[PDB]
C-alpha cells in the first residue's frame, strides 16, 4: 500500500510547500498572461491578430495551394498586409 | 519515515502541473482581447 | 450524536429519519431557501426589468406570475406600477430570515428530538393517527391558501384576463363556476389533442370557481383526517415508515411536475402570452395568419389558393371538417386565442371575416408572436438552430417547461428509489440477502 | 378451494412460475402482446402512410417494396397531430391504415407495457428478498423510449414527429433532429455519448480485468470456463491480483479494490449518462436546443471568421432545407 | 421472394427464442 | 483589416452629401438595431415579408429613396410601402406609433441616426451576407 | 551487466510505474496531449481551413481544434524539418504540422500503452486480456485517423482533433458516405450500445443481489477486500433474470468474458466499415430501390427520404468544407424544398 514517495497529503499541508508555491504558482500564471498580453504568442504561432485575417478590401482566404512552395506562398500572404 | 523530495513522481506531476498553470494564465489574459 | 455509525456521509440526511426535532430544523431552514429565492429573484428581475418592453424578452418568470394575479399591470398587459413587484420581492426576502432563523435553531440548539420536549409536536412515523392528523393540519393550510386566491380575484382586485371583452385587462371575477358537473368535468376530459384535460381551462370563472371547490374539499379532508385513523384496507395496503411516506409524496410532486410542464406550454389563460411568450401552437398559427394577411393584400384569394401538395396554401380542412390554417400548421388547429378568435365562425375560420374584418392590432399581434416563437438555444440565441447571433432570446415558456420536466422526471426516479427501499426496509432485507436463510434457496427449481 | 380469488392472487404472485407474471405483469403481458402482434403484421403487410398529412403516402412495409433496413412502421398523420386515433375512430380500417393508425396502437401499448416491465423488475426482486433498484437502472432506457416516442411528440405538437419504428426511419429521426435542434452541440447529448462510450469502455475494462485474473482450475486443453460451478461459495477470480495489475497500469489510488464500489460505478455511469441523454430529447422537445455559436468569432472590421461550429451549420441547413420537401408553405419552420 | 426470406429468418429467431427459454440446460447448483 | 472611418462614411442625403459615423455611434446603432429590429430584421432580411430586405440597392430603388441617413430616419418616424403610396405606421414600429410599439418610445433622434447608419454600414462590411438569407450564413 | 541494472531500475515499483514500455509511452503520450493543448489555445487554422481554431482567436472548448493540414500537403508526414516547413516552427504551425505531430505521436503512444499493459501483466503474473481488449481502440484510431485519410486525397479529410471538428466528421460521413446505412457501422453501435447495457445491467444486478455482511445501510464498507465468499448471490441473480427476461447467466467466467467480447467485437466491425470508406467503397444505396424510384414517382420509403437529406448536406456544406475546390454554387443550383 506504499512506495518511497512522500504522501501528497503531507506535502499539500506542509507550510514549507506553500511558502514555496505561493511564489511559484502565481509566477507561472503571470508569465503565461504576459505571453498573451505582450502579443508574443501571436508571433510564436503565426496566429492572426483580430486585424490580420484579410487585407482591407480583399475578402478572399489565404489558402495554401501547394506543398513544397507553401512556406514561400504563406510569406506572400503576409505581404498584402494580411 | 525519511521521504525524499525530487522523485520520479515529482517530475511527472510537474510536466503537467507547470504547463497547465502557464496556460490557465495565458487563457485568462485572452478574456480581455477585443476589436 | 450521529456519525458514520448511522449512515454514510453522503447519506447524511437519512441519519435524521428519527430525530423529529432536528428533522424540523431542516424543513424550516429549507422552506427558508425557497422564500429566499422567490424574494431575492423577484428583486433581481425588477432590478433588470424594463417597463416599455415585453416581459418574455427579459427572462422573467416571477414578475409575470404576479402580473397574472392583477398586480402592476393594466390594459393589454401594460405595466403600470412596479411597486407590487418590489413589495412581494422584499417581503419574501425578509420572511426568509425569520424562517432561516428557526431552521438553524431547531437543527443546532433546540431539542434534538421532540417527543419529550412536547408530546404534541413530537411524532412517531408508525403512529397512523399523528400522521393522518399532521397531514390533516397541512390539508387545511393548503385549503385556506386555495381560498386566498379566490379572495384576491373576487374581492381584492381580480386577475389578468387575456380574454377580456375589451381586450386583455385586469378583471374582477364575480361569478365563479360552482356547478360541479362543469368543474369536475375537466377531470373526465381526455388528455389528447382537442379535449385537453385540466390544461384546457380557458376562462377565469372556472379557475376561480374550481379553486373554491378545492379550497373547501381540501379543508374538509383536513378535518376528517384530524378526526380519524386510516381504515382497514388503507393499512393492509400501504407501508408505514418514514421513507415510505416520503416516496408517496415524491411520486406526487413528479406527477404535478409533468402537469405543470404541459400547462405552461399549452395553456393561454392562467399563463398569459402577454407576460410569458406566445404558446408553441400560437406562434405557428401566427405565421399562417401573417402570410395569409400579407398575400391577401397583394390580391390573392386565400379561399381557393392551392399549395404544392394540392391541399390549400392558406386554408384547409381539419379531419372533422372545420376550416383551419394550412401548411404544417394543420397540427395546431386546436389553438384558441384572443387575437385569433374574432375570425373564427361556427365552422372555423370564416372566409368573409378573414376577407375584410382583419384588424391592424391583429396583424401586428400575429407579426409579434410569429417573430417570438419559443425556439432558442442553451446560450440564449432565439430562432432555429441554423439562425445567426443577434436576437438574444428564449421564451419563458421554453425555460419553465424544460426545467420542470427534468425535475418532474428525476422525482419519478426518486419515487421509485425511495419506494423500492421502503418495501425492502419494511420486510427487512434492504441491506443484503441473509447469507444463512437465502429465500431463493428454499424455492423449487423451475429450470 | 381456499378461496378462488385468494388462490388466483397466490398464483399470479407465485415465485414458482417459469416466467414471473406479476401484478404489473397482468397489465404488461396483454399490452406487450398487442404491440408485438400489431407491429409484426404492420411491418410486413401494412400499406402506405400519409405521415406528413399532405397526402403523400410513405410505404414502409416489406410487401410494399421495403427490406429490413429500409422498412418501418410509419408514424400517424400530421393531420391527426396529438389527437387520439383508436381503430373505432375510423370509418374503416382502410382509413385507419392510411392515417398511420397502427403506430399509435403500438407506441401506446409498448410504452405502457415497458413501464409495467419496470414495475415487475421491482416486484420479483421483492418476492425474492433481494434489494430493489435494478428497475431504476432500467428506468434510463425506458425514459428514452418515452422521450423519443411520447415526450418529443407532445412537445412538437404531433405524433407524426415521433421516431418511426424502423432502421432507416430512425436515421431520419436523427438527421432531421440535428438540423432543427443541433443536438451534437448540446450538453445532455454529450453526456449521453459519454455514458455510452464509457459504458462500453468500462464494460470492456471490468470484463477483461476479471476474466484475466481467474484462478486456475482448468486443463491446458479444457475450456477455462468449466473452472466455475453454478452455486459456488468462494470467488472465481483474484480481485486482489486484478487490482494489483490495474493499480500499476495507471496508479494505485486510481484503481478499485472494493468489488461493491466497482459495481456501483459500473452501473451508475451509463444509467446516469443515459438519463441525461433522455432529458436532452425531452428538453429539446420544447425547443431549448444546443449551443448556437454561429458567427461568434468576428475580426477587427466585422468580417465573420468561421469556426468548425459554422461548418456544422452548413451541414445542418442542407438537412433543414431538404427535409419534408412539400410540407412547408411559409418562411419559418415552427413545427 | 425477398419478403419470404426476411420473414423466415425472423420466424427462425423467434423459434430459437422459445427453445432457448423453455429448453435450456437446467442450471444445476454446487454438484455440477 | 479594420473598421476604418473610411468604412464609416455613408451617404447623408439624396444630394450626394455624406456623413462619417464614429465607432461609438456604430456599436450603439448595432445595439439599438438588436433592441428594436433584429426581432424581424436579423441579418438584413425581413421575416414577416421576405420580399423586402435592407440591402442598400433595395433601399435605393425604394420610394422615396431610403438609402441614406435622411431616408431611413424619416422611415423610422413615418413608414411607407415600397412605392410610398401608403403609410404603414400602424403595423410597423415608428415614432408616430410608439404607443403601439413601446420599444420605439425611448428612441430619440440620436438613436434613430445610429440605427440608420448601422443599416448602411453593415453591407459595407458583410457584403452579400447582409442582404441574402440562410444561403449566405 | 548494465542492462539488468537498467532493467532493475525501470521495473521498480514506483507510484507511476515506468517500465521498458515507458521509454516509448511517456515521451509520445505527453507530446500528443501537449501538442493538442498547445494548438487548442495558440495555433490557428486560417491558412489551412480558413477557420479560427484556438482560444487566442476566440474559440471556446467546443469550437476549438487542431485542424488537419491543407489538401495541398497531400499525405505528407509534415516534419518540422521537412520540405514544407523547412525547419521553421511558426510556418510548421500554420501548415498544420501540429496535426501529423499529434497523430503520429499519439499513434506510438497507443502502441507503448498496450505494450505497457503487456509488460505490467507479465510482471504481476496475470493474463493479458486487458491487452487483447485494447486492440479495439487501436483499430479505431488506426483506421479512422490514418487508414481512412490515406485512402482519400490527403490528411485534410481526416478527422480534425477537436470537439466540434469531430461533429462535422460525423455529419460528413452521413452526407457523403451514408455511413449510418452501413452494416459494419450498425454492428459497431450494436456493440457499444449493447456494451453500455451489459455494464449497467451487471452493475445493478450485483448491487441489488448482495448478501448482508454488515449492520449498516451503506453496504460499501461491508466488503471483504481479501476474497473468500462471493459478495453477491450469483444463485439469486440467475433466478431473477430467468423469470423476468427468460434468459440468465450462470457462469461468472462466461458472463465476464462476454463483457469483453461484445464492445471489442463491435469496435472492430465499425473499423472495417471505415477501412472500406477509405476507398469510398461505401454502403450508400440499394439498387433495387433506386430503379423503382426512377420509373415510379409515387414510391417513397424512409430510405429515399434520407438520400435527399444527404444531397442537401453535400450541396450546402461542400463550399466552405472543401476550400481547395473553389466551389461556387449559384443560388439557383442549390437543391431546396418548398418555402424553406
Ligand atoms: C420512465 C419515465 C416515464 C416518464 C413519463 C412522462 C410522462 C409525461 C406526460 C405528461 C402528463 C400529461 C398530463 C397533461 O398535462 O396533459 C395535458 C397535455 C396537453 O394537452 C393539450 O391540450 C390542449 C391545450 O389547449 C390550450 O392551449 C392552446 C392550444 O395550444 C389553446 O389556446 C387552448 O385555448 C388552451 O386551452 C390542446 O388540445 C393541445 O393540443 C394539447 O392536446 O396532454 C398531452 O399532450 C399528453 C398526451 C397524453 C399522454 C399522457 C398519458 C399519461 C398517462
Ligand atoms: C414548521 C413550523 C414550526 C414548528 C412546527 C415548530 C414547532 C415547535 N417550535 Mg418552533 N419555530 C419555528 C417554526 C416552527 N416551530 C420558526 C420559523 C421559528 C423562528 C421564529 C421557531 C422558533 C422557535 C423557538 C425559539 C422555540 C421553538 C419551539 C418549538 C417547539 C415548542 C412549541 C412552541 O414553540 O409553541 C409556541 C406556541 C404556539 C402554539 C403559538 C404559535 C402561534 C403563532 C403566534 C401564530 C403562527 C401563525 C401561522 C404562521 C399561521 C397559521 C394560521 C393558519 C392555520 C390560519 C415546537 C416543537 C421551542 C422549543 O424549542 O421548545 C422545545 C422554542 O423555544 N420554535
Ligand atoms: C422530497 C425530496 C427528497 C428528499 C427529502 C430526499 C431525501 C433523502 N434522500 Mg433522496 N432523492 C430525491 C429526492 C429526495 N430525497 C430524488 C428526486 C432522487 C433522484 C435523483 C433521490 C435520490 C436519492 C438517492 C440515490 C439517495 C437518496 C437518499 C436520501 C436520504 C439521505 C439524504 C442524503 O443522501 O443526502 C446527501 C446529499 C448529497 C450527497 C447531495 C447530492 C448532490 C446532487 C446529486 C447534485 C445536484 C445538482 C445541483 C443542482 C447542481 C448545483 C451546481 C453545483 C456546482 C453547486 C434522504 C432521506 C440516500 C439514501 O441513503 O437512501 C435512503 C440515497 O442513497 N436520495
Ligand atoms: C437542505 C439543506 C440541508 C439541511 C437543512 C441540512 C440539515 C441538517 N443536516 Mg445535512 N446535509 C446536506 C444538506 C442539508 N442538511 C447535504 C447536501 C449533505 C451532504 C453533503 C448533508 C450531510 C449531512 C450529514 C453527513 C449530517 C447532516 C446533518 C444534519 C442535521 C444536523 C445539522 C448539523 O450537523 O449541524 C452542524 C453545525 C455546524 C457545523 C454549523 C453549520 C452552519 C449553519 C448550520 C448554517 C448557518 C446558516 C446561515 C449562514 C446563518 C443564518 C443566520 C440568520 C438567520 C440570523 C441538520 C438537520 C447531521 C445529522 O445527521 O444530524 C445529527 C449529519 O451527520 N447533514
Ligand atoms: C428551476 C427553475 C428556474 C428557471 C426556470 C429559471 C429560469 C431562468 N433563469 Mg434562473 N435561477 C434559478 C432557477 C430557475 N431559473 C435558481 C434556483 C437560481 C439561483 C441560483 C437562478 C438564478 C438565476 C440568475 C442569476 C439568472 C437567472 C436567469 C434566468 C433566465 C435565463 C435563463 C438562463 O440563461 O439559463 C442558462 C442556464 C443554464 C444553461 C445552466 C443549466 C444548469 C443545469 C440545470 C445543470 C444540470 C447539470 C446536472 C445537475 C449535473 C448533476 C449530475 C451529477 C450528479 C452526476 C431564465 C428565465 C437569468 C436572467 O434572469 O436573465 C435574463 C439570470 O441572470 N436565473
Ligand atoms: C393530498 C392530501 C391527502 C392525503 C395525503 C390523503 C391521504 C389519505 N386519505 Mg384522504 N382525503 C383528502 C386528502 C388527502 N388524503 C381530501 C381532500 C379528502 C376529501 C375529499 C379526503 C378524503 C378521504 C376519505 C373519505 C378517505 C381518505 C383516506 C385516506 C387514506 C387512504 C387513501 C388511499 O388508500 O388511497 C388509495 C385509493 C385507491 C385504492 C383508489 C385509486 C383510484 C384513484 C382514485 C383513481 C385513479 C387515480 C388517477 C391515476 C389520477 C387521474 C385523475 C382522475 C381524476 C382521472 C390516506 C392516508 C381513507 C381513509 O383511510 O380514511 C382515514 C378514506 O376513507 N381520504
Ligand atoms: C522516444 C520516443 C519518441 C518517438 C518514437 C518519436 C517519434 C517521432 N517523432 Mg518525436 N520527439 C520525442 C520523442 C519521440 N519521438 C521527444 C521527447 C521530443 C521532444 C524533444 C520529440 C520531438 C519531436 C518533434 C519536434 C518532431 C518529432 C517527430 C517525430 C516523428 C518523425 C521523426 C523522425 O523522422 O525520426 C527519425 C528517426 C531516427 C532519428 C531514429 C534513428 C535511430 C538510428 C538507430 C540511429 C542511427 C544514427 C546514425 C547517424 C545513422 C547512420 C546512417 C548513415 C548512412 C548516415 C516520429 C514519429 C516529427 C514529427 O512529428 O513530424 C510530423 C517532429 O517534427 N518529434
Ligand atoms: C418477457 C420475455 C422476453 C423474451 C426475451 C428473449 C430473450 C432472447 C434469448 C436469446 C437466447 C439467449 C441464448 O441463447 O444464450 C443463453 C445464455 C445463458 O446460458 C449461459 O450458459 C453458459 C455459457 O457457457 C453460462 O452458464 C452462462 O452464464 C449462461 O448461463 O445467455 C448468455 O449467456 C448470453 C447473454 C446474452 C443473451 C442474448 C440477449 C438477447 C438479445 C436478442 C436480440 C435479437 C433480436 C432479433 C430481432 C429479430
Ligand atoms: C507542441 C510541441 C511541443 C510540446 C509542448 C508541450 C509538451 C506542451 C504542453 C502543454 C500542456 C501540458 C498544457 C496544459 C494545459 C491545460 C489546461 C489549459 C487545462 C485547463 C483545465 C481546465 C479549465 C479544467 C476544467 C475543469 C474540468 C475539465 C473538469 C470540471 C471542473 C473544471 C472546471 C476544473 C514541443 C515543444 C515538444 C515541440 C513542438 C511541438
Ligand atoms: C441546517 C444546515 C444547513 C442549512 C442551513 C440553511 C438552509 C440555512 C438557511 C438560511 C436562510 C434562509 C437565511 C436567510 C437569510 C435572509 C436574510 C439575512 C435577509 C436579508 C434581508 C434584507 C437585508 C432585506 C432587504 C433589502 C431590501 C428591502 C432592498 C434593498 C436590499 C436589501 C437586501 C437590504 C447546512 C446545509 C448549511 C449545513 C447542515 C446544517
Ligand atoms: C526520436 C526522434 C525525436 C526527434 C526530435 C527532433 C526535434 C528537434 O528537431 C529540430 O528542430 C530544430 C529547431 O528547433 C530544427 O532546426 C531548424 O530551425 C533552425 C532555427 O530555429 C534552423 O537554424 C535550422 O537550419 C532548421 O533546420 C531542426 O531542423 C529539427 O531537426
Ligand atoms: Mn416532420 Ca419536425 Mn421538420 Mn418542421 Mn415537421
Ligand atoms: Cl424527410
Ligand atoms: Fe462483475
- φ and ψ of F65, to 5 deg: -60, 130
**CA distance linking residue F9 with residue D17, whole number of Å:** 87
- Per-residue b/e over D27-49, b at no fewer than 16 CB within 10 Å? bbbebbebbeebbeebbbebebb
Domain at F64, CATH number = 1.10.760.10
Report the SS3 class of residue A23: helix
Beta bridge partners of G161: G66
Ligand nearest the Cα atom of residue C26? 4
Task: Calculate ∠ Cα C46-C49-C53, nearest 5°.
Answer: 150
Q: What's the grid cell of residue G186?
A: 450498425
Distance of CA D321 to the CA centre of its chain: 28
Technique used: X-ray
Peptide linkage before F64 cis (omega within 30 of 0): yes
Ligand nearest the Cα atom of residue C398? 5
Check: CB of residue D126 under 8 Å from CB of residue D71.
Answer: no
3-state secondary structure chain D: CCCHHHHHHHHHCCCCCCCCCCCCHHHHHHHHHHHHHHHHHHHHHCCCECCCCCCCCECCCHHHCCCCCCCEECCCCCCCCCCCCCHHHCCCHHHHHHCCHHHHHHHHHHHHHHHHHHHHHHHHHHHCCCCCCHHHHCHHHHHHHHHHHHHHHHHHCCHHHCCCEEHHHHHHHHHHHHHHHCHHHCHHHHHHHHHHHHHHHHHHHHHHHHHHCECCCCCCCCCCCCCCCCCCCECCECHHHHHHHHHHHCCHHHCCCCHHHHHHHHHHHHHHHHHHHHHHHHHHHHCEECCCCCCCCECCCCCECCCHHHHHHHHHHHHHHHCCHHHCCCCCCCC
Are residues G250 and E20, on separate chains, in Cβ contact within 8 Å?
no
- Per-residue b/e over E9-28, b at no fewer than 16 CB within 10 Å? eeeeeeeeeeeeeeeeeebe
**CA distance linking residue D3 with residue D287, whole number of Å:** 56
**CA distance linking residue D28 with residue D121, whole number of Å:** 12
3-state secondary structure chain C: CCCCCCCCHHHHHHHHCCCCCHHHHHHHHHHHHHHHHHHHHHHHHHHHCCCCCCCCCCCCCCHHHHHHCCCCECHHHCECCCHHHHHHHHHHHHHHHHHHHHHHHHHHCCCCCCCCCCCCCCCCCCCHHHHHHHHHHHHHHHHHHHHHHHHHHHCCCCEEECCCCCCCEEECCCCCCCCHHHHHHHHHCCCCCCCCHHHHCCCHHHHHHHHHHHHHHHHHHHHHHHCCCCCCHHHHHCCCCHHHHHHHHHHHHHHHHHHHHHHHHHCCCCCCCCCCCCCHHHHHHHHHHHHHHHHHHCCCCHHHCCCCCCCCCCEEECCCCCEEECCHHHHHCCCCCCCCHHHCCECECCCCHHHHCCCHHHHHHHHHHHCCCCCEECCCCCCCCCCCCCCCCCCHHHHHHHHHHHHHHHHHHHHHHHHHHHHHHHHCCCCCECCCCCHHHHCCCCC
Q: What's the grid cell of residue E18?
A: 422459445
Angle between helices C396-427 and D101-127 (to 10 degrees): 30
**CA distance linking residue G11 with residue G20, whole number of Å:** 7
Query: CA nearest G39: which of G67, G76, G75?
Result: G67
Query: CA nearest D67: which of E7, C7, C297, C18?
Result: E7
Q: What's the grid cell of residue F31?
A: 445595439
Check: CB of residue D276 under 8 Å from CB of residue B12.
Answer: no
**CA distance linking residue A77 with residue A75, whole number of Å:** 5
- Per-residue b/e over G102-136, b at no fewer than 16 CB within 10 Å? bbbbbbbbbebbbbbbebbbeebebbbbbbbbbeb
Beta bridge partners of C161: C169
Whether residue C93 has its Cβ less than 6 Å from ligand 10:
yes
Report the SS3 class of residue A53: coil
Counting every residue written for chain B, the total comes to 35
**CA distance linking residue C56 with residue C380, whole number of Å:** 13
Q: What's the grid cell of residue D6?
A: 385468494
Q: D232 to chain A nearest CA, in Å?
A: 30
Q: F110 lies in which domain range?
A: 2-130
Query: CA nearest F77: which of F29, F101, F112?
Result: F112
Neighbours of chain B (3+ CB pairs under 8 A): A, D, G
List, as ranges, residues 325-354 from C with C-beta within 8 Å of D. Answer: 326-334
State the CB neighbour count (10 A cutoff) for residue C120.
7
**CA distance linking residue G324 with residue F18, whole number of Å:** 41
Of A36, A61, A65, the CB nearest to G72: A65
Task: List C-alpha distances in Å: C3 to C7, C8, C208.
Answer: 7, 8, 50
**What are the residues whose beta carbons fall under 8 Å from the beta carbon of D297, sequence distance 6 or more?**
D305, D307, G52, G57, G58, G59, G63
Amino acid at each position: 500500500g506504499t512506495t518511497g514517495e512522500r504522501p501528497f497529503s503531507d506535502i499539500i499541508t506542509s507550510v514549507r510547500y506553500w511558502v514555496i508555491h505561493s511564489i511559484t504558482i502565481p509566477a507561472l500564471f503571470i508569465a503565461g498572461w504576459l505571453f498573451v498580453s505582450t502579443g508574443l504568442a501571436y508571433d510564436v504561432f503565426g496566429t492572426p491578430r483580430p486585424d490580420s485575417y484579410y487585407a482591407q478590401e480583399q475578402r478572399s482566404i489565404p489558402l495554401v495551394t501547394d506543398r513544397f512552395e507553401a512556406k514561400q506562398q504563406v510569406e506572400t500572404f503576409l505581404e498584402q498586409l494580411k | 519515515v525519511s521521504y525524499p523530495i525530487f522523485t520520479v513522481r515529482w517530475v511527472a506531476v510537474h510536466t503537467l502541473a507547470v504547463p497547465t498553470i502557464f496556460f490557465l494564465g495565458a487563457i485568462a489574459a485572452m478574456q480581455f482581447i477585443q476589436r | 450524536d450521529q456519525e458514520s455509525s448511522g449512515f454514510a456521509w453522503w447519506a447524511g440526511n437519512a441519519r435524521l429519519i428519527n430525530l423529529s426535532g432536528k428533522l424540523l430544523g431542516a424543513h424550516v431552514a429549507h422552506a427558508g431557501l425557497i422564500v429566499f429565492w422567490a424574494g431575492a429573484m423577484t428583486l433581481f428581475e425588477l432590478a433588470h426589468f424594463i417597463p416599455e418592453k415585453p416581459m418574455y424578452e427579459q427572462g422573467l418568470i416571477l414578475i409575470p406570475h404576479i402580473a397574472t394575479l392583477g398586480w402592476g399591470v393594466g390594459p393589454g398587459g401594460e405595466v403600470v406600477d412596479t411597486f407590487p413587484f418590489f413589495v412581494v420581492g422584499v417581503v419574501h426576502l425578509i420572511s426568509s430570515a425569520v424562517l432561516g432563523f428557526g431552521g438553524v435553531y431547531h437543527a443546532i440548539r433546540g431539542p434534538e428530538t421532540l417527543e419529550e420536549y412536547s408530546s404534541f409536536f413530537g411524532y412517531d412515523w408508525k403512529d397512523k393517527n399523528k400522521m393522518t392528523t399532521i397531514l390533516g393540519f397541512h390539508l387545511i393550510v393548503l385549503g385556506i391558501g386555495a381560498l386566498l386566491l379566490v379572495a384576491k380575484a373576487m374581492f381584492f382586485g381580480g386577475l389578468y384576463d387575456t380574454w377580456a371583452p375589451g381586450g386583455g385587462d385586469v378583471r374582477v371575477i364575480t361569478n365563479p363556476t360552482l356547478d360541479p358537473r362543469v368543474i369536475f368535468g375537466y377531470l373526465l376530459k381526455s388528455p389528447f389533442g382537442g379535449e385537453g384535460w385540466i390544461v384546457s381551462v380557458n376562462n377565469l370563472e372556472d379557475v376561480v370557481g374550481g379553486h373554491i371547490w378545492i379550497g373547501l374539499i381540501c379543508i374538509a379532508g383536513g378535518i376528517w383526517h384530524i378526526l380519524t385513523t386510516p381504515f382497514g384496507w388503507a393499512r393492509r395496503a400501504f407501508i408505514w415508515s418514514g421513507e415510505a411516506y416520503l416516496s408517496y409524496s415524491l411520486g406526487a410532486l413528479s406527477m404535478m411536475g409533468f402537469i405543470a410542464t404541459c400547462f405552461v406550454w399549452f395553456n393561454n389563460t392562467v399563463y398569459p402570452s402577454e407576460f410569458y411568450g406566445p404558446t408553441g401552437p400560437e406562434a405557428s398559427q401566427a405565421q399562417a395568419m401573417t402570410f395569409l394577411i400579407r398575400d391577401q393584400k397583394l390580391g390573392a384569394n386565400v379561399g381557393s389558393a392551392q399549395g404544392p401538395t394540392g391541399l390549400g396554401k392558406y386554408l384547409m380542412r381539419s379531419p372533422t371538417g372545420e376550416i383551419i390554417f394550412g401548411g404544417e400548421t394543420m397540427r395546431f388547429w386546436d389553438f384558441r386565442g384572443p387575437w385569433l378568435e374574432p375570425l373564427r365562425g361556427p365552422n372555423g375560420l370564416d372566409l368573409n371575416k378573414i376577407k375584410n374584418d382583419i384588424q391592424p392590432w391583429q396583424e401586428r399581434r400575429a407579426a409579434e408572436y410569429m417573430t417570438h416563437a419559443p425556439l432558442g438555444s442553451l446560450n440564449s440565441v432565439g430562432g432555429v438552430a441554423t439562425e445567426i447571433n443577434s436576437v438574444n432570446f428564449v421564451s419563458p415558456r421554453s425555460w419553465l417547461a424544460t426545467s420542470h420536466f427534468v425535475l418532474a422526471f428525476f422525482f419519478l426516479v426518486g419515487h421509485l428509489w425511495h419506494a423500492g427501499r421502503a418495501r425492502a426496509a419494511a420486510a427487512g432485507f434492504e441491506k443484503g440477502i441473509d447469507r444463512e436463510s437465502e429465500p431463493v434457496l428454499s424455492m423449487p427449481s423451475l429450470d | 378451494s381456499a378461496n378462488l380469488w385468494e388462490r388466483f392472487c397466490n398464483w399470479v404472485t407465485s415465485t414458482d412460475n417459469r416466467l414471473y407474471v406479476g401484478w404489473f405483469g397482468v397489465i404488461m403481458i396483454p399490452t406487450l402482446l398487442a404491440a408485438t402482434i400489431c407491429f409484426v403484421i404492420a411491418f410486413i403487410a401494412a400499406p402506405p402512410v400519409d405521415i406528413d398529412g399532405i397526402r403523400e403516402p410513405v410505404s414502409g412495409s416489406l410487401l410494399y417494396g421495403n427490406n429490413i433496413i429500409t422498412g418501418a412502421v410509419v408514424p400517424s398523420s400530421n393531420a391527426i397531430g396529438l389527437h387520439f386515433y383508436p381503430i373505432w375512430e375510423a370509418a374503416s380500417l382502410d382509413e385507419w391504415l392510411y392515417n398511420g393508425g397502427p403506430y399509435q396502437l403500438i407506441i401506446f401499448h409498448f410504452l405502457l407495457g415497458a413501464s409495467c416491465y419496470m414495475g415487475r423488475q421491482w416486484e420479483l426482486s421483492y418476492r425474492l428478498g433481494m434489494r430493489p433498484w435494478i428497475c431504476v437502472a432500467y428506468s434510463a432506457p425506458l425514459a428514452s423510449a418515452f422521450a423519443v416516442f411520447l415526450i418529443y411528440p407532445i412537445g412538437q405538437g404531433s405524433f407524426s414527429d415521433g421516431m418511426p419504428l424502423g432502421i432507416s426511419g430512425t436515421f431520419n429521426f436523427m438527421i432531421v433532429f440535428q438540423a432543427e435542434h443541433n443536438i451534437l452541440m448540446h450538453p445532455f447529448h454529450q453526456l449521453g455519448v459519454a455514458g455510452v462510450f464509457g459504458g462500453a469502455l468500462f464494460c470492456a475494462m471490468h470484463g477483461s480485468l476479471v476474466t484475466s485474473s481467474l484462478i486456475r482450475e482448468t486443463t491446458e486443453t479444457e475450456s477455462a470456463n468449466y473452472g466455475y460451478k453454478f452455486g459456488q461459495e468462494e470467488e472465481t477470480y483474484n480481485i486482489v491480483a486484478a487490482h494489483g495489475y490495474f493499480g500499476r497500469l495507471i496508479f494505485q489510488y486510481a484503481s478499485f479494490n472494493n468489488s461493491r464500489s466497482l459495481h456501483f460505478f459500473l452501473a451508475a455511469w451509463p444509467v446516469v449518462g443515459v438519463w441525461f441523454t433522455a432529458l436532452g430529447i425531452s428538453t429539446m422537445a420544447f425547443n431549448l436546443n444546443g449551443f448556437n455559436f454561429n458567427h461568434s468569432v468576428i475580426d477587427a472590421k466585422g468580417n465573420v471568421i468561421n469556426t468548425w461550429a459554422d461548418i456544422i451549420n452548413r451541414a445542418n441547413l442542407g438537412m433543414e432545407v431538404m427535409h419534408e420537401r412539400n410540407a412547408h408553405n411559409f418562411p419559418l419552420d415552427l413545427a | 421472394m425477398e419478403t419470404i426470406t426476411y420473414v423466415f429468418i425472423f420466424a427462425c429467431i423467434i423459434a430459437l427464442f422459445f427453445f432457448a427459454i423453455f429448453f435450456r440446460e437446467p442450471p444445476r447448483i454446487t454438484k455440477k | 483589416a479594420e473598421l476604418t472611418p473610411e468604412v464609416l462614411t455613408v451617404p447623408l442625403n439624396s444630394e450626394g452629401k455624406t456623413i462619417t459615423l464614429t465607432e461609438k455611434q456604430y456599436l450603439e446603432g448595432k445595439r439599438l438595431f438588436q433592441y428594436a429590429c433584429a426581432s424581424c430584421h436579423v441579418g438584413g432580411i425581413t421575416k414577416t415579408n421576405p420580399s423586402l430586405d435592407l440591402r442598400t440597392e433595395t433601399l435605393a430603388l425604394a420610394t422615396p429613396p431610403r438609402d441614406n441617413i435622411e431616408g431611413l430616419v424619416d422611415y423610422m418616424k413615418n413608414p411607407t410601402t415600397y412605392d410610398g403610396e401608403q403609410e404603414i405606421a400602424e403595423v410597423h414600429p415608428s415614432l408616430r406609433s410608439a404607443d403601439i410599439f413601446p420599444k420605439m418610445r425611448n428612441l430619440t433622434e440620436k438613436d434613430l441616426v445610429a440605427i440608420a447608419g448601422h443599416i448602411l454600414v453593415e453591407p459595407k462590411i458583410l457584403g452579400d451576407k447582409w442582404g441574402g438569407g440562410k444561403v449566405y450564413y | 551487466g548494465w542492462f539488468d541494472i537498467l532493467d532493475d531500475w525501470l521495473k521498480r515499483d514506483r507510484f507511476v510505474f515506468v517500465g521498458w514500455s515507458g521509454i516509448l509511452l511517456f515521451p509520445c503520450a505527453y507530446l500528443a496531449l501537449g501538442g493538442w493543448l498547445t494548438g487548442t489555445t495558440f495555433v490557428t487554422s486560417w491558412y489551412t481551413h480558413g477557420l479560427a481554431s484556438s482560444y487566442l482567436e476566440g474559440c471556446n472548448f467546443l469550437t476549438v481544434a487542431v485542424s488537419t493540414p491543407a489538401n495541398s500537403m497531400g499525405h505528407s508526414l509534415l516534419l518540422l524539418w521537412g520540405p514544407e516547413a523547412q525547419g521553421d516552427f511558426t510556418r510548421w504551425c500554420q501548415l498544420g504540422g501540429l496535426w501529423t505531430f499529434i497523430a503520429l505521436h499519439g499513434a506510438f503512444g497507443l502502441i507503448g500503452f498496450m505494450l505497457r499493459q503487456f509488460e505490467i501483466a507479465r510482471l504481476v503474473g496475470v493474463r493479458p486480456y486487458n491487452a487483447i481488449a485494447f486492440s479495439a481502440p487501436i483499430a479505431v484510431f488506426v483506421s479512422v485517423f490514418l487508414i481512412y485519410p490515406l485512402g482519400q486525397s490527403s490528411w485534410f479529410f481526416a478527422p480534425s482533433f477537436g470537439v466540434a471538428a469531430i461533429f462535422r466528421f460525423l455529419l460528413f460521413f452521413q452526407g457523403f458516405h451514408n455511413w449510418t446505412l452501413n452494416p459494419f457501422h450498425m454492428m459497431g453501435v450494436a456493440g457499444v450500445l449493447g456494451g453500455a447495457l451489459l455494464c449497467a445491467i451487471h452493475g445493478a444486478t450485483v448491487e441489488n443481489t448482495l448478501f448482508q455482511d454488515g449492520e449498516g445501510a451503506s453496504t460499501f464498507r461491508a466488503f471483504n477486500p481479501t476474497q473468500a465468499e462471493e459478495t453477491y448471490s450469483m444463485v439469486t441473480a440467475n433466478r431473477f433474470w430467468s423469470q423476468i427476461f427468460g434468459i440468465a447467466f450462470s457462469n461468472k467466467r462466461w458472463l465476464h468474458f462476454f463483457m469483453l467480447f461484445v464492445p471489442v467485437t463491435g469496435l472492430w466491425m465499425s473499423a472495417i466499415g471505415v477501412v472500406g470508406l477509405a476507398l469510398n467503397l461505401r454502403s450508400y444505396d440499394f439498387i433495387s430501390q433506386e430503379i423503382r424510384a426512377a420509373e415510379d414517382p409515387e414510391f417513397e420509403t424512409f430510405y429515399t427520404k434520407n438520400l435527399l437529406l444527404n444531397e442537401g448536406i453535400r450541396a450546402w456544406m461542400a463550399p466552405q468544407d472543401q476550400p481547395h475546390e473553389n466551389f461556387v454554387f449559384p443560388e439557383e443550383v442549390l437543391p431546396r424544398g418548398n418555402a424553406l
